[PDB]
Amino acid sequence: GLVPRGSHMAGAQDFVPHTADLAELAAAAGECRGCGLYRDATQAVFGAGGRSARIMMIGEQPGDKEDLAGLPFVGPAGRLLDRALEAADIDRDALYVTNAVKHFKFTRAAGGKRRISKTPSRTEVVACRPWLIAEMTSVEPDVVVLLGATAAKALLGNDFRVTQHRGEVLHVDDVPGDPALVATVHPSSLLAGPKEERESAFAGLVDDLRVAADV
Ligand code: SF4
C-alpha cells in the first residue's frame, strides 16, 4: 500500500513520536487524541522523573489536582504515597511516576468539593498503552510498581486481581524489557476507612514498595 495498515491506526499509537526522550514524548502527548478523554480534561499529564530511574510507578489516571498541576501524584493520594515512600526508604530521585491513562476522566456532583474520577474503560487503557510502552522503553526500569486495579490490569491482564497477589514479584513475557512487576493498592484507597484498617493497609503498602525497591 502507498500507506500501510498497522498499529498506527489504533489508539494513541500514531501520536507517539519515534523518540525515547521524555520531554519530547510529553510534548507529543499534549496533542494526543487517541481516545475521547482529551476533550474534557484540562491537559495531558505525562509521567515525571528521569530515564535513569530504577523504579517506575504507575497509577490509574491524573486526578482533579493533577489535571491542573500538570504533574502526577500531587493531591492527597500523592501525599500519602510520599509518606509511604519515605517510610520505605525510597529516594524520590530513583523514581519515574506516571499513570495508565494520561487524561483525567471525571464528572461533578452539585455541592461537591472536587471533580469525581471515573474509571477508564479497558478500551481507554488499551488506547493509551502506547504511551506507557514508550515510557517503559525510555526508562528501562528494573521494577514497575502498579498502583491499583487499572494499572495492574494494564500490564498483567484484564482478569488480574491486585488483592490476590500482594507482596509478590511478578514477571510477564510481553512487557518490554521484562522488568519485575509489583502490584499494590492505590494510595487513594488508604485515605478513608477505620483507623486500624488504614494503618494496617499503610504498612502493607510500605511492604510492597520495599519488595520493589529490593529488586
Ligand atoms: S487518555 Fe491517553 S490515549 Fe486517550 S487522548 Fe489522553 S493521552 Fe491519548
Q: What's the reported resolution, in angstroms, to a tenth?
A: 1.6
Experimental technique behind these coordinates: X-ray
Residue 34's domain comprises 1-215
| CB distance 41 to ligand 1 below 6 Å | no
CA of 208 to the centre of ligand 1 (A): 29
Are 104 and 66 spatial neighbours (Cβ–Cβ below 8 Å)? yes
Greatest distance between any 2 Cα atoms in the chain? 64
Give the DSSP letter of residue 7: G
Q: Is 198 exposed, middle or buried (0-12, 13-18, 19+ CB in 10 A)?
A: middle
| CB distance 34 to ligand 1 below 6 Å | yes
Question: 145: part of which helix (H) or strand (E)?
Answer: strand 143-147
C-alpha grid cell for residue 10? 489504533
Total count of domains within the chain:
1
